[PDB]
Amino acid sequence: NALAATNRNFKLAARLLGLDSKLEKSLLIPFREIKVECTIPKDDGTLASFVGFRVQHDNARGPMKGGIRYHPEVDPDEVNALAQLMTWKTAVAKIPYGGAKGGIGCDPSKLSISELERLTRVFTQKIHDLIGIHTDVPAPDMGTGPQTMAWILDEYSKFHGYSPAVVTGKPIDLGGSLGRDAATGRGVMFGTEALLNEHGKTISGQRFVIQGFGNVGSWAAKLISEKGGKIVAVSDITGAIKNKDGIDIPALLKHTKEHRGVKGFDGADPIDPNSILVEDCDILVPAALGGVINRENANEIKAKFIIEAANHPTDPDADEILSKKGVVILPDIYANSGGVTVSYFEWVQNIQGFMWEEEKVNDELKTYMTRSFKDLKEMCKTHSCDLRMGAFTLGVNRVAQATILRGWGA
Amino acid sequence: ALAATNRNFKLAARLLGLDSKLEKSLLIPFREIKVECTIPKDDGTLASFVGFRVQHDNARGPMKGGIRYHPEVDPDEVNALAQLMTWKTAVAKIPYGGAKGGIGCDPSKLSISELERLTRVFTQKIHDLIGIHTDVPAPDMGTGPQTMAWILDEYSKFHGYSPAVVTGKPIDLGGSLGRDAATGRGVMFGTEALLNEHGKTISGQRFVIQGFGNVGSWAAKLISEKGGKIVAVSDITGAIKNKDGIDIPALLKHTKEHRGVKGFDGADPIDPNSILVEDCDILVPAALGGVINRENANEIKAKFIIEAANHPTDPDADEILSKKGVVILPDIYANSGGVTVSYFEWVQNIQGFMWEEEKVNDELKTYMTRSFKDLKEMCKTHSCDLRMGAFTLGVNRVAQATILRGWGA
Amino acid sequence: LAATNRNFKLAARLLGLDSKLEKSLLIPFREIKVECTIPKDDGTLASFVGFRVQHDNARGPMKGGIRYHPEVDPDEVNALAQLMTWKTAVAKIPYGGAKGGIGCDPSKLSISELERLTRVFTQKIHDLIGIHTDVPAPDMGTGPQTMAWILDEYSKFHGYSPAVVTGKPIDLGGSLGRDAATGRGVMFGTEALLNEHGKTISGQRFVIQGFGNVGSWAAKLISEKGGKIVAVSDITGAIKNKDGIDIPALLKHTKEHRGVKGFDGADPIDPNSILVEDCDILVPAALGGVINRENANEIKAKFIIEAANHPTDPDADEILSKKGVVILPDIYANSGGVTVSYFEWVQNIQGFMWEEEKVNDELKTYMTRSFKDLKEMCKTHSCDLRMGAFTLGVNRVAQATILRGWGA
Amino acid sequence: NALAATNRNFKLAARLLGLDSKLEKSLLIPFREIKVECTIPKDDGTLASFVGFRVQHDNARGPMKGGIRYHPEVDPDEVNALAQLMTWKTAVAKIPYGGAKGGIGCDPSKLSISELERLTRVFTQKIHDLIGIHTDVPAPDMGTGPQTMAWILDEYSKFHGYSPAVVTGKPIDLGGSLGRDAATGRGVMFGTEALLNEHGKTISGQRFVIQGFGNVGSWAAKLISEKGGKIVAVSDITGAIKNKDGIDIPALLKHTKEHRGVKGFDGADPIDPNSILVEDCDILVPAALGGVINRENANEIKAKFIIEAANHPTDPDADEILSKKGVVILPDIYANSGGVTVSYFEWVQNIQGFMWEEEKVNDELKTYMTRSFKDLKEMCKTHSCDLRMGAFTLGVNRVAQATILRGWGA
Ligand SMILES: [K+]
Ligand SMILES: [K+]
Ligand SMILES: [K+]
Ligand SMILES: [K+]
């Protein structure tokens, strides 16, 4: 209900710009769509056939970037929307990538680790000629992780020699970047301060509600509290906890790693899991799932700021409700761009054959996100639009310019 | 009768002892590609088209399949034809796999300069996905030898001169002699093979040929030259009959002059809808699919039907004509002379040395008789009709190569 | 071992070969060792060494088998690779000599492990071989399926490459007549040898020691050319018939059973006396060094066809050299195999398979020409057949080496 | 030779870690071993045939690195040991290389410069397909030098285009690195300060005896005196000299370069050339050859610290004797790693197409060696072992982790 909106925002941005319909159509059509057969022997000896795939949407601004999703549900339209979304996101970030997205229709929880490596290596064999250091650089996604990237790297290197830059999100021992783990969360804290400063405020003192406590949410909470932010409520799959005076995030993290959830945490009262988004605060950070803010609860949001750390957490219905209430929303396409930005930095480090210290990684991230927020701000002033539309017009403009500069045939 | 393809495959897999897991893998195509083809039109404005190529199976060698320029593109049909080509090349005993591709577009609305432009972009967008030993495209609806010349030309910018990358080229650019008559000549070859098995020969037999294009005319020419009596021929302009035999050479001059058979002295005109039920020995549907169907199958008087066209017999008519004792030479074999000679064109390009036409035709006789022998022996093995014998033979060969090559332990 | 090197220096001195050029001809072009580590079926790791000696490629791509065997003597492997270089030159096929394998016991591995290992080996050497570089073939412990796996795995790195290996299944581009190739070659050379002496295969009495893949095929085609196969031995025992063993009937018996011992139509004889049987033509077809000091004087044949490799070590060579026993050397006699393996490659290069009659007809052409070239070397240097073969082969490699030059 | 101890140290380190015996077996086996025929025309026209070779031991952690030896003595076992040592050495240094080692069995002192170029190019032609920018990067060694590398670079570039990164040790005019001459000596001084700092000490004031005065030894004395180190005794090819207040190193360096030895230096009294190891001081630097410290001279060593600047300078017996005395030994695998580390920097600069100023080379060298020393120490803390074993365990562990992360197929 918010991802079908991708094409809508695009067409909206294209109309904000003076985009010609013929160029718009070209930008909509992906550069390449690939489906491959992945047949492996299972541990019981019998054959198992899976379909791997890769949508390579756009490469005008450089090599394509996108995750590999191991998930049984594969909608052709949905995957295409994500590949296109990555094209604008990389453009908003001003990193020299295009957008792509791939995966294998499969359920990893029903495969042995032996089968998952076997499956991953076959998939790499079937697409090795379609990706590459300067063509398409995959990344982890739902159902895959650093070990997956390691296996891809190993098999790919058999066909083209050692190629650490062919995937990002690798283990540190295999050429992964420092700061990759904290990247998206750190970006969320960075972008929040940029937006607050634009209103004469700073993170220090503000009250935060963080819905979701996975990698992104947990890191956000850590770095934000370290900036003086008052984290008053946090939820995860195990429950939701509140502390009006501020949750001690270091203590929570220590509890959360040991106990595998925020539930049972001494030092914060448990609260109704369905009250977390409507809890009283200044800044609301949806950091788990999509569609959690909708027509059913938009009027009950109390924050003046919503930092879309998760993807598509706010449906179009809630978007217009909160606008007509003075709520500013930092759109996900910008708010969580620290991840893909740092992945660009990982690739750069591999291209340069020399890793950066973490202070440099983080320093460049601050620079890239400061600049992109400024450009994002100026697009809004130019087109008298909200932040989300400013991000899409900014992204579509850059792709369109690069496309035009490179030309079509004769 | 086209969507019936999976029916023939699923049956053949059951006639063979194929494991259900291996059967599913054989159904899954090796690769499916969609590419953006945007070109500047003659007026300067942009035009965007989608090109595509389904590469179904390559167990038995490089993939082979036509390129279709047509605005209507059904994904299932494209996949079905690619799968069909996999079985057909296996029946032919030529070392290819099956593929099928094209661009969704209407060439009648494009200038010739735009069509070259569009063809070159498509080649640039897929050149890394085809190749001398990978995938050898060929013409199909909306493309022809000129299109192949353009592909050859653009592909060679990326890989050096590569005449073997496409078949159906002009003779001047390494196309094969005998390429025009190949399908038609193959039909006559398969007819004699089938008749020889019944102690009969072409000489004397009465032929009805529905459709008089390249395939139909060539069959009529070469069959009449073997002593066959063509008693009726129909085409887009009408149908003409002569119970004592139509003089094909004279008819060919009339049809080349008058762009149709209607008006030919030496054959009375007859109802174009009556052509399939005319009295004869051998009926050659050579125009369209499904022309022999549930409504007219019982009314066929021929003891043999030579499927020169593709899918001329619906499953319904297959059983009616089977029980009435009609032997049907199935399309997958009967018109394989074309794909066989396209293999010969490629072989000649691979060997850097063209064949005399007599060699082309002589190898074709060898390839189609030997494949008929194997086709015959499969039917006896499984007590099945020719069409089912062909699918089981084709699926068995691919399965053998797939199993020999393995799935990485 | 050093058995080969002994013939080589002898041939090198027969020709006027420069000692420095001779040293280079002896040194192999390349020696490769690679680690092949696979997970075993129980999950634990297993590490094997693969290897390939690439001896000489002056005359074209190198050719040689892959042997899966636990015993790996570096001296043997180099000797075999060097021998292949000479063998391909006597055959006049445009190949050089190479030889490789994996130290492992295939009898202790599942087919899953054997496939895994084969593919890993291919990954480890794919960049060191190729359709125009080095074309492997089956050998001890490998067969057509092994070639199929190599073909499949190699093709992931370089596209479909049927010509990268020979000995493939026919379903994957293997040659017709490949199975009978070596056996037919021995029959061809026997007729050439007899024709030089005013005799023909027809009428001559054959005792055939060994009835494996090669021996069985030899017996078949000679019986069909009128040869009287009067005694045959193999791993299970020996049978004799002065009027001739019916090779089809013998083949029927052996195909049902696992040996000829029990064959109606030939009474059994002593398994170790076959070499000393009364006949005109004796064919050692099993193992090396079997013709030796202990039984050389008791050979009654005037003709010995070396179907096996190194069946006569130097000791018997000189004993039989006197008294007039003719020996057709292994380097030529079993070259039918490597010749038809060349034809398999040619067919794959041409993308168009040959009828079997063409394979066999070209086989007859290539071996006749090489025999004629072989005899003239013997006449030129007043030497026996074995040295004549070495002189011919080493001459061809040296000529090719010199024409191509050394930079300068 | 403490060279044959290589397999000795490894199986120990592999046992200190929980290394599966089968994985230990694979880590022992080299990835590839190559022998090639190198036949060239000599200047008199006659043929000469040589055998070139390259052991490529391990590449789990990256491209292989190793020297090319032009030397008539070729022991296969020793060459394999050296390539294996390099695998561990690069892992301790934390540079992304594996270990290799090669050469040509030949005596360059019996060859003209024209024949040496001919032979060098023929060797490159025979192995060009087995090395590469991301595969295996050779370097000078005994019998080869910058000119050798220039010829390799030139001939290789005919086959793969300009490839300055294919070898290190190049002439500076062809992309060689600044500071490469002082690298090993400077590295010795860096590690010495790192070691002393853990003991609350600094280079300043302490007494140095430096045995051997080659490239490494001379540079060490130079850099050490400049930090305040008191070099009280020096040995070289011509003899040994002493000065209880400290030998004036700048003045001596002037004396040694003109005269080509230390024999004759005003400002330092001569001493027994065979007494050099038993001189009283704080830090003794064996900097010439291996096995110079053995059981016969171990008990009377007066230093609390031995900086193994040379390779294999301490035999196993003395290692335990000096441990049983409170003597700390900085092992050669770490102490002289400045060379290989800067060779990595040379490669990096060529990969990036942009040379570093010398100060940057030296600052990065300091960074890499302090970081590796800190890592080396924490390994000792975990395994309660000496510095030498701490280095092997650290290197073997890193290789083992990379190997496992990349996996084995199925
Ligand atoms: K596009
Ligand atoms: K398939
Ligand atoms: K040689
Ligand atoms: K290893």
PDB file of C-alpha atoms in Angstrom, chain D residues 101-267:
ATOM      1  CA  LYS D 101      58.170 -17.739  -3.868  1.00  0.00           C
ATOM      2  CA  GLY D 102      59.927 -18.369  -7.154  1.00  0.00           C
ATOM      3  CA  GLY D 103      63.086 -18.036  -9.192  1.00  0.00           C
ATOM      4  CA  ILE D 104      65.363 -19.487 -11.858  1.00  0.00           C
ATOM      5  CA  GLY D 105      68.057 -22.035 -11.184  1.00  0.00           C
ATOM      6  CA  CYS D 106      71.014 -20.196 -12.706  1.00  0.00           C
ATOM      7  CA  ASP D 107      74.142 -18.290 -11.720  1.00  0.00           C
ATOM      8  CA  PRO D 108      73.856 -14.645 -12.846  1.00  0.00           C
ATOM      9  CA  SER D 109      77.552 -14.177 -12.142  1.00  0.00           C
ATOM     10  CA  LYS D 110      78.147 -16.502 -15.129  1.00  0.00           C
ATOM     11  CA  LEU D 111      75.783 -14.626 -17.470  1.00  0.00           C
ATOM     12  CA  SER D 112      76.133 -11.416 -19.438  1.00  0.00           C
ATOM     13  CA  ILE D 113      73.637  -8.636 -18.881  1.00  0.00           C
ATOM     14  CA  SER D 114      72.208  -9.401 -22.337  1.00  0.00           C
ATOM     15  CA  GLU D 115      71.675 -13.048 -21.434  1.00  0.00           C
ATOM     16  CA  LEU D 116      70.115 -12.056 -18.111  1.00  0.00           C
ATOM     17  CA  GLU D 117      67.551  -9.861 -19.887  1.00  0.00           C
ATOM     18  CA  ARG D 118      66.873 -12.621 -22.419  1.00  0.00           C
ATOM     19  CA  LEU D 119      66.404 -15.146 -19.623  1.00  0.00           C
ATOM     20  CA  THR D 120      64.256 -12.725 -17.615  1.00  0.00           C
ATOM     21  CA  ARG D 121      61.923 -12.094 -20.533  1.00  0.00           C
ATOM     22  CA  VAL D 122      61.657 -15.768 -21.447  1.00  0.00           C
ATOM     23  CA  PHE D 123      60.726 -16.546 -17.832  1.00  0.00           C
ATOM     24  CA  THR D 124      58.056 -13.812 -17.944  1.00  0.00           C
ATOM     25  CA  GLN D 125      56.651 -15.251 -21.189  1.00  0.00           C
ATOM     26  CA  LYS D 126      56.430 -18.710 -19.559  1.00  0.00           C
ATOM     27  CA  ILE D 127      54.579 -17.578 -16.407  1.00  0.00           C
ATOM     28  CA  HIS D 128      52.734 -14.407 -17.426  1.00  0.00           C
ATOM     29  CA  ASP D 129      49.423 -16.323 -17.407  1.00  0.00           C
ATOM     30  CA  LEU D 130      50.060 -17.485 -13.825  1.00  0.00           C
ATOM     31  CA  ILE D 131      50.750 -14.137 -12.145  1.00  0.00           C
ATOM     32  CA  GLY D 132      48.998 -10.796 -12.289  1.00  0.00           C
ATOM     33  CA  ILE D 133      47.851  -7.586 -10.643  1.00  0.00           C
ATOM     34  CA  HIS D 134      45.360  -9.583  -8.563  1.00  0.00           C
ATOM     35  CA  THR D 135      46.947 -13.058  -8.700  1.00  0.00           C
ATOM     36  CA  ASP D 136      50.652 -13.064  -7.778  1.00  0.00           C
ATOM     37  CA  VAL D 137      52.986 -10.068  -7.487  1.00  0.00           C
ATOM     38  CA  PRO D 138      56.710 -10.932  -7.611  1.00  0.00           C
ATOM     39  CA  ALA D 139      59.493  -8.903  -6.023  1.00  0.00           C
ATOM     40  CA  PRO D 140      63.308  -8.827  -6.049  1.00  0.00           C
ATOM     41  CA  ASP D 141      65.331 -11.394  -4.144  1.00  0.00           C
ATOM     42  CA  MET D 142      68.815 -12.919  -4.193  1.00  0.00           C
ATOM     43  CA  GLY D 143      70.246 -12.491  -7.661  1.00  0.00           C
ATOM     44  CA  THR D 144      67.523 -10.098  -8.848  1.00  0.00           C
ATOM     45  CA  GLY D 145      66.858  -6.406  -8.386  1.00  0.00           C
ATOM     46  CA  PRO D 146      64.996  -3.338  -9.639  1.00  0.00           C
ATOM     47  CA  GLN D 147      66.352  -3.841 -13.147  1.00  0.00           C
ATOM     48  CA  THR D 148      65.111  -7.419 -13.120  1.00  0.00           C
ATOM     49  CA  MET D 149      61.664  -6.152 -12.129  1.00  0.00           C
ATOM     50  CA  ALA D 150      61.743  -3.535 -14.889  1.00  0.00           C
ATOM     51  CA  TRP D 151      62.274  -6.282 -17.469  1.00  0.00           C
ATOM     52  CA  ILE D 152      59.475  -8.363 -15.948  1.00  0.00           C
ATOM     53  CA  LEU D 153      57.207  -5.310 -15.993  1.00  0.00           C
ATOM     54  CA  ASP D 154      58.113  -4.566 -19.593  1.00  0.00           C
ATOM     55  CA  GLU D 155      57.685  -8.095 -20.940  1.00  0.00           C
ATOM     56  CA  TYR D 156      54.529  -8.745 -18.934  1.00  0.00           C
ATOM     57  CA  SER D 157      53.038  -5.517 -20.290  1.00  0.00           C
ATOM     58  CA  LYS D 158      53.286  -6.857 -23.826  1.00  0.00           C
ATOM     59  CA  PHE D 159      50.837  -9.577 -22.820  1.00  0.00           C
ATOM     60  CA  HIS D 160      48.395  -7.636 -20.625  1.00  0.00           C
ATOM     61  CA  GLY D 161      48.969  -3.911 -21.209  1.00  0.00           C
ATOM     62  CA  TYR D 162      50.820  -1.552 -18.892  1.00  0.00           C
ATOM     63  CA  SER D 163      50.786  -3.251 -15.478  1.00  0.00           C
ATOM     64  CA  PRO D 164      53.088  -1.409 -13.063  1.00  0.00           C
ATOM     65  CA  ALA D 165      51.490  -3.207 -10.126  1.00  0.00           C
ATOM     66  CA  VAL D 166      52.520  -6.656 -11.367  1.00  0.00           C
ATOM     67  CA  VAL D 167      55.878  -6.461  -9.543  1.00  0.00           C
ATOM     68  CA  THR D 168      57.252  -4.430  -6.660  1.00  0.00           C
ATOM     69  CA  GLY D 169      60.807  -3.283  -6.208  1.00  0.00           C
ATOM     70  CA  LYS D 170      60.602  -1.418  -9.476  1.00  0.00           C
ATOM     71  CA  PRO D 171      62.888   1.501 -10.224  1.00  0.00           C
ATOM     72  CA  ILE D 172      61.310   4.751  -9.083  1.00  0.00           C
ATOM     73  CA  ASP D 173      61.206   5.927 -12.719  1.00  0.00           C
ATOM     74  CA  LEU D 174      58.848   3.024 -13.420  1.00  0.00           C
ATOM     75  CA  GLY D 175      56.594   3.503 -10.402  1.00  0.00           C
ATOM     76  CA  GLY D 176      58.690   2.285  -7.480  1.00  0.00           C
ATOM     77  CA  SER D 177      57.881   3.576  -4.016  1.00  0.00           C
ATOM     78  CA  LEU D 178      59.653   6.205  -1.957  1.00  0.00           C
ATOM     79  CA  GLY D 179      61.114   5.080   1.354  1.00  0.00           C
ATOM     80  CA  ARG D 180      61.550   1.507   0.149  1.00  0.00           C
ATOM     81  CA  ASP D 181      65.289   1.612   0.959  1.00  0.00           C
ATOM     82  CA  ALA D 182      64.846   2.440   4.630  1.00  0.00           C
ATOM     83  CA  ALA D 183      61.782   0.227   5.026  1.00  0.00           C
ATOM     84  CA  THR D 184      63.091  -2.847   6.848  1.00  0.00           C
ATOM     85  CA  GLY D 185      65.482  -0.854   9.007  1.00  0.00           C
ATOM     86  CA  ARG D 186      62.799   1.700   9.835  1.00  0.00           C
ATOM     87  CA  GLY D 187      60.408  -1.140  10.606  1.00  0.00           C
ATOM     88  CA  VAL D 188      62.943  -2.542  13.048  1.00  0.00           C
ATOM     89  CA  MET D 189      63.024   0.765  14.909  1.00  0.00           C
ATOM     90  CA  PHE D 190      59.222   1.015  14.887  1.00  0.00           C
ATOM     91  CA  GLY D 191      58.718  -2.417  16.432  1.00  0.00           C
ATOM     92  CA  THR D 192      61.467  -1.774  18.967  1.00  0.00           C
ATOM     93  CA  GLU D 193      59.603   1.254  20.328  1.00  0.00           C
ATOM     94  CA  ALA D 194      56.310  -0.675  20.361  1.00  0.00           C
ATOM     95  CA  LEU D 195      57.990  -3.453  22.364  1.00  0.00           C
ATOM     96  CA  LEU D 196      59.665  -1.041  24.785  1.00  0.00           C
ATOM     97  CA  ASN D 197      56.494   1.001  25.343  1.00  0.00           C
ATOM     98  CA  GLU D 198      54.811  -2.103  26.802  1.00  0.00           C
ATOM     99  CA  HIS D 199      57.654  -2.122  29.350  1.00  0.00           C
ATOM    100  CA  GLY D 200      57.265   1.558  30.211  1.00  0.00           C
ATOM    101  CA  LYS D 201      60.462   2.322  28.294  1.00  0.00           C
ATOM    102  CA  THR D 202      61.450   4.175  25.139  1.00  0.00           C
ATOM    103  CA  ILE D 203      64.310   3.926  22.653  1.00  0.00           C
ATOM    104  CA  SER D 204      65.914   6.994  24.256  1.00  0.00           C
ATOM    105  CA  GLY D 205      68.978   6.191  26.397  1.00  0.00           C
ATOM    106  CA  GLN D 206      69.092   2.416  26.165  1.00  0.00           C
ATOM    107  CA  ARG D 207      72.162   0.589  24.831  1.00  0.00           C
ATOM    108  CA  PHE D 208      72.130  -1.022  21.389  1.00  0.00           C
ATOM    109  CA  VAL D 209      74.549  -3.570  19.976  1.00  0.00           C
ATOM    110  CA  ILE D 210      73.946  -4.022  16.264  1.00  0.00           C
ATOM    111  CA  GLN D 211      75.492  -7.131  14.715  1.00  0.00           C
ATOM    112  CA  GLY D 212      75.726  -6.713  10.974  1.00  0.00           C
ATOM    113  CA  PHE D 213      75.856  -3.395   9.145  1.00  0.00           C
ATOM    114  CA  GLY D 214      74.167  -4.006   5.805  1.00  0.00           C
ATOM    115  CA  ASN D 215      71.187  -2.125   4.418  1.00  0.00           C
ATOM    116  CA  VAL D 216      68.963  -3.085   7.348  1.00  0.00           C
ATOM    117  CA  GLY D 217      71.536  -2.732  10.115  1.00  0.00           C
ATOM    118  CA  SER D 218      72.938   0.579   8.911  1.00  0.00           C
ATOM    119  CA  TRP D 219      69.475   2.093   8.538  1.00  0.00           C
ATOM    120  CA  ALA D 220      68.462   0.858  11.990  1.00  0.00           C
ATOM    121  CA  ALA D 221      71.477   2.420  13.689  1.00  0.00           C
ATOM    122  CA  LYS D 222      70.725   5.659  11.845  1.00  0.00           C
ATOM    123  CA  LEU D 223      67.054   5.837  12.784  1.00  0.00           C
ATOM    124  CA  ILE D 224      67.695   4.508  16.311  1.00  0.00           C
ATOM    125  CA  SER D 225      70.331   7.103  17.208  1.00  0.00           C
ATOM    126  CA  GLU D 226      67.993   9.828  15.959  1.00  0.00           C
ATOM    127  CA  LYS D 227      65.434   8.753  18.566  1.00  0.00           C
ATOM    128  CA  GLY D 228      68.089   8.857  21.270  1.00  0.00           C
ATOM    129  CA  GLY D 229      69.130   5.213  21.174  1.00  0.00           C
ATOM    130  CA  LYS D 230      72.702   4.609  22.317  1.00  0.00           C
ATOM    131  CA  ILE D 231      74.391   2.317  19.810  1.00  0.00           C
ATOM    132  CA  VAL D 232      77.374   1.159  21.846  1.00  0.00           C
ATOM    133  CA  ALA D 233      78.765  -1.549  19.540  1.00  0.00           C
ATOM    134  CA  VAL D 234      78.515  -2.380  15.836  1.00  0.00           C
ATOM    135  CA  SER D 235      79.692  -5.325  13.745  1.00  0.00           C
ATOM    136  CA  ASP D 236      80.040  -5.636   9.979  1.00  0.00           C
ATOM    137  CA  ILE D 237      82.041  -7.473   7.311  1.00  0.00           C
ATOM    138  CA  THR D 238      85.287  -5.709   8.336  1.00  0.00           C
ATOM    139  CA  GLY D 239      85.169  -6.084  12.125  1.00  0.00           C
ATOM    140  CA  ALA D 240      83.545  -4.817  15.309  1.00  0.00           C
ATOM    141  CA  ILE D 241      83.869  -1.455  17.075  1.00  0.00           C
ATOM    142  CA  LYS D 242      82.786  -0.258  20.517  1.00  0.00           C
ATOM    143  CA  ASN D 243      82.201   3.039  22.331  1.00  0.00           C
ATOM    144  CA  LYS D 244      80.750   2.990  25.848  1.00  0.00           C
ATOM    145  CA  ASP D 245      79.155   6.440  25.414  1.00  0.00           C
ATOM    146  CA  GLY D 246      77.574   5.594  22.054  1.00  0.00           C
ATOM    147  CA  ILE D 247      79.021   5.407  18.554  1.00  0.00           C
ATOM    148  CA  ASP D 248      78.412   8.603  16.588  1.00  0.00           C
ATOM    149  CA  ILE D 249      76.242   7.052  13.905  1.00  0.00           C
ATOM    150  CA  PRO D 250      76.099  10.003  11.427  1.00  0.00           C
ATOM    151  CA  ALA D 251      79.890  10.293  11.540  1.00  0.00           C
ATOM    152  CA  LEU D 252      80.316   6.531  11.235  1.00  0.00           C
ATOM    153  CA  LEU D 253      77.926   6.369   8.264  1.00  0.00           C
ATOM    154  CA  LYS D 254      80.086   8.925   6.468  1.00  0.00           C
ATOM    155  CA  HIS D 255      83.156   6.838   7.317  1.00  0.00           C
ATOM    156  CA  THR D 256      81.630   3.527   6.231  1.00  0.00           C
ATOM    157  CA  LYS D 257      80.329   4.697   2.846  1.00  0.00           C
ATOM    158  CA  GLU D 258      83.630   6.129   1.664  1.00  0.00           C
ATOM    159  CA  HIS D 259      85.786   3.325   3.067  1.00  0.00           C
ATOM    160  CA  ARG D 260      83.238   0.497   2.518  1.00  0.00           C
ATOM    161  CA  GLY D 261      83.545  -0.885   6.041  1.00  0.00           C
ATOM    162  CA  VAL D 262      83.897   0.137   9.668  1.00  0.00           C
ATOM    163  CA  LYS D 263      87.593  -0.860   9.912  1.00  0.00           C
ATOM    164  CA  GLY D 264      89.302   2.397  10.873  1.00  0.00           C
ATOM    165  CA  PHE D 265      86.693   4.556  12.622  1.00  0.00           C
ATOM    166  CA  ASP D 266      88.039   7.259  14.912  1.00  0.00           C
ATOM    167  CA  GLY D 267      85.599   7.594  17.783  1.00  0.00           C
TER     168      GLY D 267
END
